[PDB]
Amino acid sequence: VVLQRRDWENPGVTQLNRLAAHPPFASWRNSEEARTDRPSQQLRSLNGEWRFAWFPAPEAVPESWLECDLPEADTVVVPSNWQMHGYDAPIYTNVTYPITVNPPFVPTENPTGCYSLTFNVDESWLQEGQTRIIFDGVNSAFHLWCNGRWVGYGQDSRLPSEFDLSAFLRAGENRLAVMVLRWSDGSYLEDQDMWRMSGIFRDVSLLHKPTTQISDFHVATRFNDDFSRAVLEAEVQMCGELRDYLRVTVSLWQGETQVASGTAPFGGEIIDERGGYADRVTLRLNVENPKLWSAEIPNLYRAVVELHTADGTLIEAEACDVGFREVRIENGLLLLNGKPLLIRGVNRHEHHPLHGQVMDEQTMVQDILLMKQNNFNAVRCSHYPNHPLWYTLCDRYGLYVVDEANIETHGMVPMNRLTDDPRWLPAMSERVTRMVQRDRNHPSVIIWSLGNESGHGANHDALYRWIKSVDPSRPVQYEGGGADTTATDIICPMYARVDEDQPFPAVPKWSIKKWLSLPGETRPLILCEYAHAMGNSLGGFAKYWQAFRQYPRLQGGFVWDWVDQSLIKYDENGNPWSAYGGDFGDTPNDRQFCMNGLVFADRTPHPALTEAKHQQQFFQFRLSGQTIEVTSEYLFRHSDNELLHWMVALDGKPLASGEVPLDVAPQGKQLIELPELPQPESAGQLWLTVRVVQPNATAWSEAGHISAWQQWRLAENLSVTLPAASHAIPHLTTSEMDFCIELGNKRWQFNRQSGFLSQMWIGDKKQLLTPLRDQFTRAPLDNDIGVTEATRIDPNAWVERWKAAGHYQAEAALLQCTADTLADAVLITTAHAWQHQGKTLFISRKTYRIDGSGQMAITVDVEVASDTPHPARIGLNCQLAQVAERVNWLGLGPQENYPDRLTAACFDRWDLPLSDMYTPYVFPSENGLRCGTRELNYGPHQWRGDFQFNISRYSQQQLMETSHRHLLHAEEGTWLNIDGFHMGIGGDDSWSPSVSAEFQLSAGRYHYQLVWCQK
Amino acid sequence: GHYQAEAALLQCTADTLADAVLITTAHAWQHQGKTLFISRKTYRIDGSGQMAITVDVEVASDTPHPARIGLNCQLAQVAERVNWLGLGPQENYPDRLTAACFDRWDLPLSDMYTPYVFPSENGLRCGTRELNYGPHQWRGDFQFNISRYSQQQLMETSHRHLLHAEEGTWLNIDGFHMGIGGDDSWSPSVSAEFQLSAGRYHYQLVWCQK
């Protein structure tokens, strides 16, 4: 029957014998346990070692497995993904389905995981009531047997499937057998851009309920105009025999204080001509001055739902955390508790580099803490309902949640092929309805989403209306079909740019500012995905935040995304390394496109995270004279855990500092008058840095946590005093092949054939391993590459434009190399042309002026052909012989920063170990640049000017040729890149050019100057 | 003190090269002990009669962004025509140059002055790579105006009819010039991207005989 009916190739069958969905249950038999959320004796975990065997197809599974353990089986941890145990390969594909597109059919070779468990059941559980099993997540479909007898079937990898085992169990030992299919008709609705895995990857549990039971409950909170009064309404449903003596009590608790209670027998109000629900009752509780829930202050109450008899005997209790909040859209604005939200959001997949798609409490907490510490207040469940614990943590720590149905059909042509087809409405409906049934009581969930990237079909319209009808308390959004369809309350585009239109046919991505005011349009706009954080990215992040702050109806967005989907593999030395698409023999695959996170898989931050934190600050600052104006962007809380530290420094040297308590009302302002600052002794630039510090620890932060900062230039005193003239004069030695300059034990050598500084000596010690030469290219970032591939060139990608123009192949031709002796210096003058196939790309004209103090002043003037693609950089590079421990600079830092991602960086004196000047992006690229640098120190060297630089043990060539960070090898000495100018990194998306015009090197003529001397 | 600032000499040296003489200068402009601008130049005069002028200017970050960064002189020559390769033919400024076209333009000198009834800076042409006037040629990438009226006279005269042609010709050649604005005329209206706020500025000119 099971193999005959092939339920996994039939979208008409999404389950067999599966129980109705409902909010989290524990069946407490003690009301105080329910109140305190203590573990329930009626809810048992089957998260232990199970038996597991892999088969290539369900037809290969022997019948004997139903009755007894396979001796070839292994003992494995559950929950798990079986790919993470090495039984078969995980597959990384983005859009293209991992199976032939032939709905509803799947491959005949369909990896089948056979799970079994021998376990004990207490006799008390079988003497009365109902024993069910709950599988929180099985990917992607499964049949269940208990003691050899078939129980049921379930689909949807991301919601719990529950089955009644009451009739199947015996006291003492029982055996479960679970046949999990990798592919099913369910796979057509699970085409998310992520690793394709399978197995029993979320909790398995047993729940005991009495025969007469709470079968469902819904909690609603409604408010008066100023939120000083609320009514809690709790609808409770029962299963079992109705009796007149049955009662429901709902009580509400604020900590240990019961603030409200109501009791009633079953029997709802009249609904229609046939009466009402005899098996339901609704309790209404009045609450005066409720403490309101928000991300800012996650005030929670406890609601306890008791099923009991009239004489006071408890049958069972259920419970939930209640957050008093109202979500509504009014006059085009998303309001929470009557105030307009600014969504500092991020998309977050459930990913662990070791455990795959199994989520654990410690990782969830780690994520939430890091999110809140970096000024996020919102999370989108891209693109499926999450592990149930996630919502509990968001309720308690305070994050706004978009809960999203497990529906993505991206690889269909056209995208809405299934979603517009009524045959697929049943399968889709369950993915929406069962999510709402599970999660509707969580205050953290503020918005429902219909799924992701499935075009716009009539099924979306049907299900949009279903949610609006069943749960008016939350807006419904959905991006498919152009982000502004009839199936969305919120304009929710993905990667729509701030100012630039992308007028794609049928589904344009308008400038977000333009989108708001299109004729007839009135809705709020919140990007479901923006600022694609793939590799060296988040260029232009500040442009979004400026627009969000200026435009009331631009209420923010969700960054794509939180964490790199890299997986751990092991090399010959047993060393773990970070792997992406194709590294498991998976083909076709989309390579590094699974790594788009603000953090690495182990939760180490990428440099981009600090840019996000800074731009998402909750305090805004202005300076006028001596006065700092602090504005609060909080809607609800006062700044009751904040002080402002200020510091004034002269080119990194502290001059004065102080602290002032912050006492700002939500949306309020505070004026802070700085004391008279003593005029600086020396020439240079005064910089003011302020930071907001939280003195006290919180649930989400340590004492001393810095939440916000800003810098301003104050007075500058330009240096007019001429340095004391040196009593030494450098000497020029002219040969046919070289111009040499000597000064004491120091020597500089200019090769007359090449026109470059080929060597420098301090004594007999060589300083260079490679000559100092111009550089106009960078090892391409993920943003420079886009979707280009050797077998499928995208001619529009920056890297392909540079390659085709010959930028990477360009050869320096010497035009001029002269030497002159001045009164106090030797002057070398050079000119080079870079050419490719008869075309002059760049001309570089330099002077080198070496004086008696041993300083070498370098002037560089570059011409760039107007018709060549704008170059990635205009700078110099060389391989230094020195390997030193520290890097010390006066400039923007301390973290990696680029021209379109430097707002977070501060100007000061920074000193880091050399290894911190390299950013270990899993896919290697140009990295570690620091901008706006006036002084750089490394070993015996000092460079002064106004430049950008990176410094590391890796050449641009190696970074360019190496596809994985673990394969990199430190080269001899230290590669230094000093740029007069560097192109933006972009990132609005990572599949098309995204570097804004103002960060492109398009000026045609460029000037910069450096001084190279001894520290 | 921008209008009051006096040039203070910091450095003036001369060097003989293989095929050239190199004059190096540095000046500071100060007002009441405050240094507003520093200008560092080299003048390279070669055997072909060309004088290459390299200018590097520092602007104190806390002084209001200056109206222009350039050079001026009063030429002895009064010539009939002005010939330039750059944006024209009409007056154009950095935030008002979209209508102008890059080409070879040739106008009478009088057309290089715009007779605004209330006199001011006027007649600039931007994006100019070559300027010709009598025996003189200037090459680079600059903005310029050229007329018989000094900036001082234009500043001091309230009506165009009271202007008098001065001896010779006043040339203003700018590496950089501030936007003119105009969103309104009663509050600052020059957009940030047209303010001279970069702190350090570089430009180069070659002066020769045509």
Ligand SMILES: O=C1O[C@H](CO)[C@H](O)[C@H](O)[C@H]1O
């Ligand atoms: O449009 C999208 O962009 C992302 C690219 O990394 C990712 O595929 C998301 O799941 C998808 O919604």
Ligand SMILES: [Mg+2]
């Ligand atoms: Mg099916």
Ligand SMILES: [Mg+2]
């Ligand atoms: Mg997709």
Ligand code: NA
């Ligand atoms: Na806004």
Ligand code: NA
């Ligand atoms: Na991706």
Ligand code: NA
């Ligand atoms: Na405070």
Ligand code: NA
């Ligand atoms: Na690479």
Ligand code: NA
């Ligand atoms: Na005037």
